Amino acid sequence: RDGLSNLARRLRFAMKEGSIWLGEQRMILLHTAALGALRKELVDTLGMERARGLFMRMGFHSGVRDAELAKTMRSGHSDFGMLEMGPCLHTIEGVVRVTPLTVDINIAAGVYHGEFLWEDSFEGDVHRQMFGVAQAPVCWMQIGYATGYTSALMGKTILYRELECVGCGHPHCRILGKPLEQWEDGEAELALYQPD
């Protein structure tokens, strides 16, 4: 659409340089099976908790870099048209089919309240094939990205949580995003986003 066809110009493949660039960031195409295998080794080795952390932060970094890109395409787009580049880029990257349910966003006022549908989550899919169906949501990297993108664009922390997840048997994933303090457990969600 207008959010994908436009962000498509920022993507160029250079088989002449063996490289891929999305905006100003170099990219690779990576086999989901390969990342699933890495997940199983990290989970089995560092535990499920330490592992989710590592994936959430990898997602965060990715979401931030795409927010930088989006911000160079500010133009005459609204806050919402700004926001929607995130879901757009997430789709182009082959991670999930993002479907915005309802978004309330003002950047200047520090107001954001967002809810999205996720169809065909790579991360849920991969997780059931490696661990089987899961107790709690598994799209760690995908959530980190949401968190990373939206914080960067708002210049303030916006944590997301998966409300429903394909990893837990549900038909899809579903997520809610809102400012850190608007979260009861928001202090400790933020803790997941720190290395040391």
**Binding to ligand NPO in span 120-149, by CB under 6 A:** 145-146, 149
User: CA distances (Å), 109 to each of 35, 67, 105, 150, 156, in order?
Assistant: 39, 18, 9, 14, 11
Contacting ligand NPO (CB under 6 A), which of 51, 56, 83, 126? 83
Q: Does 174 bind ligand NPO (CB under 6 A)?
A: no
Q: Is 168 in the site for a copy of itself (CB under 8 A)?
A: no
Q: Which residue has the tokens 């990257």?
A: 93
Residue 181, C-beta contacts closer than 8 angstroms, at least 6 positions apart:
none
What whole-number distance in Å separates Cα of residue 156 and Cα of residue 146? 13
Per the CB < 8 A criterion, the answer to whether 13 and 27 are in contact is no
Q: Indicate the helix (H) or strand (E) that contains 161.
A: strand 158-164
Closest contact distance (angstroms) between CB of 66 and ligand NPO is 8
165 is in an annotated binding site: yes
Give me the 86-125 binding string for ligand NPO, x by CB under 6 A, dash otherwise: xx--x-----x-x---------------x-x---------
Name every residue whose Cβ is closer than 8 Å to that of residue 110 and which is 6 or more positions away in sequence. 154, 156, 179
| Residue 124 contact among a copy of itself, Zn ion, ligand NPO, none, beta carbon within 5 to 8 Å by kind | Zn ion
Q: Which is nearer to a copy of itself, 21 or 80 (CB)?
A: 21
Best CA proximity match to 175, nearest among 111, 84, 102, 89: 102
Q: From the list a copy of itself, Zn ion, ligand NPO, none, pick the one residue 190 interacts with, judged by a Cβ distance below 5 to 8 Å according to partner type.
A: none
| Binding of ligand NPO by 3 (CB under 6 A) | no
Structure tokens at 196: 């040391």
C-beta of residue 58 within 8 angstroms of C-beta of residue 144: yes
Mark the binding-site residues for Zn(2+), compressed into ranges: 139, 162, 165, 173
Q: Which residues bind a copy of itself (CB under 8 A)?
A: 4, 8, 11, 13-20, 22, 25-35, 37-38, 41-42, 44-46, 54, 57-59, 61-62, 65-66, 90-98, 119-120, 122, 125, 195-196
Q: Which residues bind ligand NPO (CB under 6 A)?
A: 83, 86-87, 90, 96, 98, 114, 116, 145-146, 149-150, 177
